[PDB]
Every structure is written in C-alpha cells, then in structure tokens.
Amino acid sequence: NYEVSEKAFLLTQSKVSIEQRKEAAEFVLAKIKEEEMAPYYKYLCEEYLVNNGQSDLEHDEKSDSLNEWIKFDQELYNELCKKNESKIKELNEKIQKLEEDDEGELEQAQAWINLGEYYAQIGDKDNAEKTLGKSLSKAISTGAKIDVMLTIARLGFFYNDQLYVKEKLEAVNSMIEKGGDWERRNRYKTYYGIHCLAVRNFKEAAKLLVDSLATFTSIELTSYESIATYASVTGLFTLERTDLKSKVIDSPELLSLISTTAALQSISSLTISLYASDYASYFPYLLETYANVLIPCKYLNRHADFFVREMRRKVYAQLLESYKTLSLKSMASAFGVSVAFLDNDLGKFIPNKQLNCVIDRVNGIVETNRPDNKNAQYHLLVKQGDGLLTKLQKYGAAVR
Amino acid sequence: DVGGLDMQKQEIREAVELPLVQADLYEQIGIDPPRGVLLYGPPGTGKTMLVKAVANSTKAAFIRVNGSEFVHKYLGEGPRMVRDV
Amino acid sequence: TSILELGQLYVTMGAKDKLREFIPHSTEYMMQFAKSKTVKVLKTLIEKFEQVPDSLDDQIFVCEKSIEFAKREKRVFLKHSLSIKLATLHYQKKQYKDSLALINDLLREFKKLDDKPSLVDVHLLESKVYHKLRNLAKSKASLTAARTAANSIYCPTQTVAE
Amino acid sequence: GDELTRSHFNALYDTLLESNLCKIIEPFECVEISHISKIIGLDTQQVEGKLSQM
Amino acid sequence: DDFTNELKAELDRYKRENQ
Amino acid sequence: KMNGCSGADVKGVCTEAGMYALRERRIHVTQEDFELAVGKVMNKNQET
Structure with a gap:
C-alpha cells in the first residue's frame, strides 16, 4: 500500500521534471488493478489541490491535470464492484457458515482480520474497525496480536493519519507485552521514529532508528530505500561527531547500505565532508540532499527548510571548537x-x-x-535552576 | 599471551564475553546462553594461564577453586559452601 | 591434449577471437572420451585463460556457452565448478552485486547436497565480495566457517595460504 | 596502485604526524604556526587541517 | 527559504570560478 | 537424522543454532544452519 503513496506523492510537488509524474503513474496504474486503491485513489483529490486534484468525473467536475489516470470512468466503476463482491460479499458468506458450525477459535478471529483488511481497500473504515474490534477480544497470544496491530499500522501509512493510529498501536502493545522477535517490535519502533517527524521531535526520532537494522523492509508498509533515508538523515542530525565516528561512518550495514543505492547522499556526502572538515564541496551536498531526498520522501518533506537551516548551524560548531x-x-x-x-x-x-x-x-x-571551565555551570545553572523554581511556585502560590 | 589458542579463544569469547557485553542478542533470537563450559586438556600449558587472561578483558571477579579443597572430617560444611559461593 | 597446447597459443598470438568458438565445438568429442567426464577437459580450457592475460568478455562467454549444449547432463551435480567461476570473474569486473545475487541462490545447494569441502572455496570468494563492500560482519562470519571446517578436510597450498 | 596500501598510507601519515606533534605540544604552546609548518615541512593549510581534526 | 539559499549559492559559483 | 538424542540433547541445539546466525548478525536462522548445528550436537558424545 506504501508503493502507491510513495510514487503518487511525487505528483504533489515536482519543480524540475514532468516525466517524474508520468513514471510514478506507471506504478500506480499497476497496483490499482490487483488491489483496489479507491480510499487512497479518492484521497488523491482530497490531499493536494490545484495540480491534479481538480480532475474527477464523478463527485466534482473540473479538468486540470498532468495525469489523466486519476479520474473515475466506466471501467474503474465496474472493477470497484467486482473487488467489493469477491473480498467482502463472497468471503463473508463463507465466514457466516463457519460461525454457525463453530469451527475453531483463532481461525475465525484471523478470518475476521483478513476480511477487515479488505474493507480498508474498499474505502469503508467503519466496518474495517468493527470487524477488527470483534476479533480484538479473541486475541491473547502474539499469534492474533500481530494481525490486529497490522490493520491499525496500515492506517498510519496508507491514510497518512498520525492522530488515531499511534494511540491504538500503543494500547494493543501495552495490553500484552511480548514482542516476539525484534522485527515484529519494529512496527512499534519504526512508526515511533516516523511519528516524531510529524510533531517535530528531532533527536527523539533517531533513538530507535540508529539502533535499527538497515535491511528492514516491510514491503506494503514501507520500502527498502524509504526507510534507509529516514535513519540516515535523522541519525546524522541527532548524534554529534563524537558518536558519528564509532557508529554511523563505520558500520557493517550502513557501509553496505550506501553502496546499494545512490539516493541516500547522507552517510556518504554529508558525513565524510563533516569528518574531513571540507566545506568547499559540503555546501552543494545540502542542495542534493534537499531536492533528491527530502522532497521525494513523504515524512522528510514536512520539515523542508528545518533541515538545511539547522544542519548548517551545527556544522559551524564543529569548526568553532577546533x-x-x-x-x-x-x-x-x-x-x-x-x-x-x-x-x-x-x-x-x-x-x-x-x-x-x-x-x-x-x-x-x-x-x-570558549567558556573554558565554565561549561554547563555558567548560564545553564542559573537559567535551569531558577527556571524550574518558577514552575515550582505555580502550584504553591495559587494552591488549588 | 600464547598463540595457537584461536580454537579455544573463539570458544571463550562466545561463552564468556558474548553474554557479558550484549545481553539483548539472546532475547532477539529467542535463545539462552549456557551456564558453563567444560575444558578438556592438560592444565598449565596454554590452558590455566589462559583462564586468568579472561578476567583481564571481561573485568570480572575470578574465583579460584581447587578440587583438593573442602577437606574435613566433619559433614555439612563442604556441601554448604557450594551453595554459598 | 593437443587442444590444450593450441588454446594457449591462440590467446597469446591474438587468435583468442577464434578460440572462444572452438571450445563449444568439442561437445561431440565429449560423448565418448573417458565415458563423458567433460568436467576435466572444459575446466582446463578455461584455466588456460588465467595464465595468459585475456579480457573478461571471452572468459565469461565460454562458461555461459558450453553449458547450454548436451554437456548439461554432466554439469548437473558439478555445476558448482562453473558457478564459482562466474562469481570469480565478477571480482575483476568490480561488480559484486550480480555475484551476490547468485551466491544467495547457490548457498541453499551447498549443504550436504554436493560437496562438503567445497565450502572453503565458496566462503573464500564470498569474503572477497564483502571485502570491497566494507562489511566486517559478513566477512568475518564466512571466513571463520571455512577456516573451521578446514581442519577436517584438506585444501591445496594456494587455498590454505589464501 | 594498491587499495589496501593506500588505506594504510593515511594511517602512517597520522602516525608520524602524531609523533611530530607530540614533540611540539609537549613544551609550552603559543608558538607561531609558520614556525610549526617549517618543522613539519608541509603547507600551512595542511598542518592546520590535520591538527584541528585531531 | 530554499529559494534564497539556493540562489545565492549558484550566483557566487559563477563569479568564484571566473576568478 | 539424530542418533541417541534425549530430550536435553534437542534443548541444547537452540543455543548452538543461534551462534551460526549471530556471526552473520541475523535473528532468523536459515535452514542451512540447523542441520550444521544438529550434526555438531549429535557428535558431542562421539567426539574423539
């Protein structure tokens, strides 16, 4: 489901090449045939407007687009009913017979989850959470817990909603805490660092991302090259040069990750120039990191200027100390x-x-x-010392 | 300090230094570390002194116990010290 | 035996363009001599390309040519000999990605289905793949497995010293 | 020509440099940078670049 | 914004390379 | 393929099976590493 949201995101902002929108449209047309993208396919005109967002033949009638494949027609209307009968009407009749015959326990709960995942692709989230809530009571061990969390995890990536997702993911994980392997725990850990980019937590995002492996690929939830840019850009901004030498620049996986694809331009161009203190070629790397990394990625395009402006301030600090x-x-x-x-x-x-x-x-x-022996006791001890005393007087001055 | 021990050195690192440094590698895989290891060979030659070298890298307390110890005419003190240690 | 002396003189004198097409023409001779056993003749012909300097284009073309002929029946079990050569020539090509994708599919066939000692030659070449990749986790893992099993079996002096 | 030899070239470059800088840093500091480059025998920008990195 | 930083970086490169 | 293995012999294979995959730093043990570990555990009693 993420392959469409990643490619169709280039439709929102393209300042250079028009072919980037047509090339990304080829991946969208291929996925809509196998699985119905109608909830996100209708979300295309409800997300970003005044580019392709005005083209629809059904709800609102206007023609402005660079892409004519996002408009409804007689073919997609018939295919919408065909996918709705097979994934819902045909499957629910077989599940209804299993409810009366009393066949298994977790098998009926898992069948409701797989059925509930189909309502998400039809565009109805009311019955998707209704069938998921009924199977939630049947979840005890990690067998049925992974499938319940998998449905809610799609709500964050597929619908791009950071509000009602994490609250549900934390409640399911905190109910029964096991985790299985370390990869099943990544679903809570990876989405944690991704959600930090929405509320701008900065260094909090890279806590679990730096320790995470570089080979993790969730396919429909996230891609291989997408997660590679999240840990490389955020991890470089979090850990200072003291921690970059023993972790980032030297790693078994990270050195293998930069050679896989050239779309990173973080742990190579930005790290080596920072370690070698070469400022001549370091400046154009920020433009390539902004255009070819931050813009095409989903959650890395939210900050925009907050990357280069903050990264340029910290790179001078490394020069001022030397x-x-x-x-x-x-x-x-x-x-x-x-x-x-x-x-x-x-x-x-x-x-x-x-x-x-x-x-x-x-x-x-x-x-x-240079503060010399002053360090952190000069202006921090008075500000943080007396500043917390102001918060102490909040409840003591006004009582209740 | 003595070469040619790489056969034994790789065995000690996995059964001593591995569980001591990183304890999270066992919970991720789902396996538990062994509670001991048996060494077969002549003591004093590339063996006994190598055991004392383990406490150097691991920075752990080394307990030297001899099989000729706990010799006494009474009873109950010998078997009690095994639980106490 | 006469072909062995001819193939060495072709690449040196500049006739290697004709030699690459002469090697697959020996399939008719392999249906009789030594009751098949083509693996001895073809491996030595390819070995002649190592001593005399030759481009990587002719070395790869021969290995992917004679395998498609009737010689495939003899190459069923022993294919590991021609599979390692393809990944070995990719080292001088400086492309480790095409060789890594092959090894990942090959490693499933090397456990007690073909040859026990041949793991040493596989992990040795695998260590060369991750060497240029700057990965110390896979290089130390593959090399240790080959060196551990090297006590039970025996390798030639060139392999042991490597 | 060898990649491994070039990798150890920078290691030997910093090894002999650290031994030469230790001779400069051991006495009292606040000496002219130009006099430091004359003892090392390299460019002023190269001496300031390698020293500040350490 | 990005338009200000990118413009001043490209205009200086044309002048610096000509010196 | 096991020979004379009791309940505790199989229980000790889990630790040995995780060591081969740890050298490659992978939490998932491939099928190739199981038979190599079982052959070593079975030979513990017959070693030398």
Whole structure:
C-alpha cells in the first residue's frame, strides 16, 4: 500500500521534471488493478489541490491535470464492484457458515482480520474497525496480536493519519507485552521514529532508528530505500561527531547500505565532508540532499527548510571548537558562498543564543567564545535552576 | 599471551564475553546462553594461564577453586559452601 | 591434449577471437572420451585463460556457452565448478552485486547436497565480495566457517595460504 | 596502485604526524604556526587541517 | 527559504570560478 | 537424522543454532544452519 503513496506523492510537488509524474503513474496504474486503491485513489483529490486534484468525473467536475489516470470512468466503476463482491460479499458468506458450525477459535478471529483488511481497500473504515474490534477480544497470544496491530499500522501509512493510529498501536502493545522477535517490535519502533517527524521531535526520532537494522523492509508498509533515508538523515542530525565516528561512518550495514543505492547522499556526502572538515564541496551536498531526498520522501518533506537551516548551524560548531579564531575572507569566499549570504544565516543564529562566537567587521576574523571551565555551570545553572523554581511556585502560590 | 589458542579463544569469547557485553542478542533470537563450559586438556600449558587472561578483558571477579579443597572430617560444611559461593 | 597446447597459443598470438568458438565445438568429442567426464577437459580450457592475460568478455562467454549444449547432463551435480567461476570473474569486473545475487541462490545447494569441502572455496570468494563492500560482519562470519571446517578436510597450498 | 596500501598510507601519515606533534605540544604552546609548518615541512593549510581534526 | 539559499549559492559559483 | 538424542540433547541445539546466525548478525536462522548445528550436537558424545 506504501508503493502507491510513495510514487503518487511525487505528483504533489515536482519543480524540475514532468516525466517524474508520468513514471510514478506507471506504478500506480499497476497496483490499482490487483488491489483496489479507491480510499487512497479518492484521497488523491482530497490531499493536494490545484495540480491534479481538480480532475474527477464523478463527485466534482473540473479538468486540470498532468495525469489523466486519476479520474473515475466506466471501467474503474465496474472493477470497484467486482473487488467489493469477491473480498467482502463472497468471503463473508463463507465466514457466516463457519460461525454457525463453530469451527475453531483463532481461525475465525484471523478470518475476521483478513476480511477487515479488505474493507480498508474498499474505502469503508467503519466496518474495517468493527470487524477488527470483534476479533480484538479473541486475541491473547502474539499469534492474533500481530494481525490486529497490522490493520491499525496500515492506517498510519496508507491514510497518512498520525492522530488515531499511534494511540491504538500503543494500547494493543501495552495490553500484552511480548514482542516476539525484534522485527515484529519494529512496527512499534519504526512508526515511533516516523511519528516524531510529524510533531517535530528531532533527536527523539533517531533513538530507535540508529539502533535499527538497515535491511528492514516491510514491503506494503514501507520500502527498502524509504526507510534507509529516514535513519540516515535523522541519525546524522541527532548524534554529534563524537558518536558519528564509532557508529554511523563505520558500520557493517550502513557501509553496505550506501553502496546499494545512490539516493541516500547522507552517510556518504554529508558525513565524510563533516569528518574531513571540507566545506568547499559540503555546501552543494545540502542542495542534493534537499531536492533528491527530502522532497521525494513523504515524512522528510514536512520539515523542508528545518533541515538545511539547522544542519548548517551545527556544522559551524564543529569548526568553532577546533579554532579560537578564523578568517572571514576564507569563510565568506573560499568556501563557495558570498559575504551577504553568510551574514543572513548567522544573522538569525546569534540573537537566539544557539552558539558562542565573535564576528568581526573591519578586521574580518571569526573568533570562537570558549567558556573554558565554565561549561554547563555558567548560564545553564542559573537559567535551569531558577527556571524550574518558577514552575515550582505555580502550584504553591495559587494552591488549588 | 600464547598463540595457537584461536580454537579455544573463539570458544571463550562466545561463552564468556558474548553474554557479558550484549545481553539483548539472546532475547532477539529467542535463545539462552549456557551456564558453563567444560575444558578438556592438560592444565598449565596454554590452558590455566589462559583462564586468568579472561578476567583481564571481561573485568570480572575470578574465583579460584581447587578440587583438593573442602577437606574435613566433619559433614555439612563442604556441601554448604557450594551453595554459598 | 593437443587442444590444450593450441588454446594457449591462440590467446597469446591474438587468435583468442577464434578460440572462444572452438571450445563449444568439442561437445561431440565429449560423448565418448573417458565415458563423458567433460568436467576435466572444459575446466582446463578455461584455466588456460588465467595464465595468459585475456579480457573478461571471452572468459565469461565460454562458461555461459558450453553449458547450454548436451554437456548439461554432466554439469548437473558439478555445476558448482562453473558457478564459482562466474562469481570469480565478477571480482575483476568490480561488480559484486550480480555475484551476490547468485551466491544467495547457490548457498541453499551447498549443504550436504554436493560437496562438503567445497565450502572453503565458496566462503573464500564470498569474503572477497564483502571485502570491497566494507562489511566486517559478513566477512568475518564466512571466513571463520571455512577456516573451521578446514581442519577436517584438506585444501591445496594456494587455498590454505589464501 | 594498491587499495589496501593506500588505506594504510593515511594511517602512517597520522602516525608520524602524531609523533611530530607530540614533540611540539609537549613544551609550552603559543608558538607561531609558520614556525610549526617549517618543522613539519608541509603547507600551512595542511598542518592546520590535520591538527584541528585531531 | 530554499529559494534564497539556493540562489545565492549558484550566483557566487559563477563569479568564484571566473576568478 | 539424530542418533541417541534425549530430550536435553534437542534443548541444547537452540543455543548452538543461534551462534551460526549471530556471526552473520541475523535473528532468523536459515535452514542451512540447523542441520550444521544438529550434526555438531549429535557428535558431542562421539567426539574423539
């Protein structure tokens, strides 16, 4: 189900090539024949508008699109009824006979789950959760628990809903805690780091992603190259260079992951340039990471500017720690940028107290302000010490 | 300290250093580590001194017990020390 | 025996273009001599390409040619000899992905269905695949399995030292 | 020409450099960078780049 | 935004490579 | 394929079966590693 949501997401924003939309349309047309995408197929016009979202022959009549395959017709209307009779009408009649004959226990619960998964592809979520809720009481061990969690896990990836999914996934996992192997636990662990990108948790996302394996592929839930970009980009932003040398840049799987596909451009272009402290070619890597990684990915396109703006602030901190002073002529020219471009980035960073530095105008020397023995007891002990005392006085001043 | 022990060194690392360092590898696979290992061979030659070398890398407390110990004319003290240790 | 002396002179003098087509023409000779047993003649002809320098195009073309003829009946059990050669020539090709996809399908056939000692040659070449891949987990795993079983069986001096 | 030999070239590059830097860092610091490059015999940008990385 | 950072990076590359 | 294996002989195969897959760092043990482990456990009594 994720293969369609990944390819059709390129239909939303394409600023360069038109063929990217037609190439991604070939994967959509192939999957809609085997499985009915009608809930997401109708969600195409309800997601992003004023591109392809105005083209429909049924609910709303307008023609504006670069893709004519997303509009209903007489063929898809007949196929919608054929898939609805086989996956629901034909299967429910056989399950109804098993209910009266009393055949098995978990077999009827698993049959309701497989039947409930078909309502998700027809576009009716009321009967999908109704048949799933009846089979939830029959779940005891991890045999029927994986299938119940699998249906709710689809709600997050297929319907792109971060609200009612995680609340249900946590309730099912916390009811009976076993986990089976480590891969069945990834469904809760991988979606955890993915949900952190919606509410912008930053370093919290990479907690379970860095320790996760790079060979994990959920197919219909997620692809191989999609999860590879989530752990590479978020893991690089979380762990500092101290932890990058013993984990990211040197790993048995990660070194094998970068050679599989060239669509990462994170653990190779960004990591080596950061480890070698080469700022000449490091700047164009951020543009390739933004265009060819962040934009095509689903959850990596939500932040947008929040990647390059924050990553550029931290890469300067690695340079400020290795020198007391610097050269403004070398930073604003030799690294591939201009003078006005450097003052715009550092202009917003200084008043936010995100770093300690000394910028020179006439002399043109970038000097680092080093606390020496001050460290974390200088401005943090007074701010965090007295700041928490303000929260302590909240309930003590007003009582109840 | 003594070469040619790679046959025994790979066996000690799996039965000693493996369960001590990473305990989560057993829960992921679904297996449990063994509670001991039996060594067959002459002591003092590439064997006994190698056992003391295990406490160097593992940084663990080494308990030296001899089979000629717990010799006494009474009863009940010998079998009690096995449970106490 | 005379063909062995001719094939060595063709690649050196520049006749290797004609030699690649002469090798599959020996199928008619294999139906009689030594009661089939083609694996001895064809493996030595391919071995001649190792001593005299030759491009990887002619070395791969011969292995994928004579296998499609009637020689396949003798190559049923011993196919591991021609399968390792295909993955070995991919090392100089600097492509380990086409060889890894083959080995993944081959490894199911190497457990007690063909040859016990041949694992050493398989894990040795497999260690060379993950060597350029910069993976120390698979390289130390495959090499240890071949070195552990190397005590029960015996390998030639070139294999043991490797 | 050898990939393994080139991999150990940077290891020997930092090995002889660490022994040379240890001779500079052991006495008192605050010496001119140009005088440091004359002892090492490399470019000023190369000396500042390899030292700051360590 | 991304339009500001990408524009200033490309315009400087044309001038820097010509020096 | 087991010879003279009691209930505890099979129980000890689980630990040996997980060591071959741990060298490759995989939580799922392939079918190739089971028979190689059972052959080693069965030969423990007949070793030397």
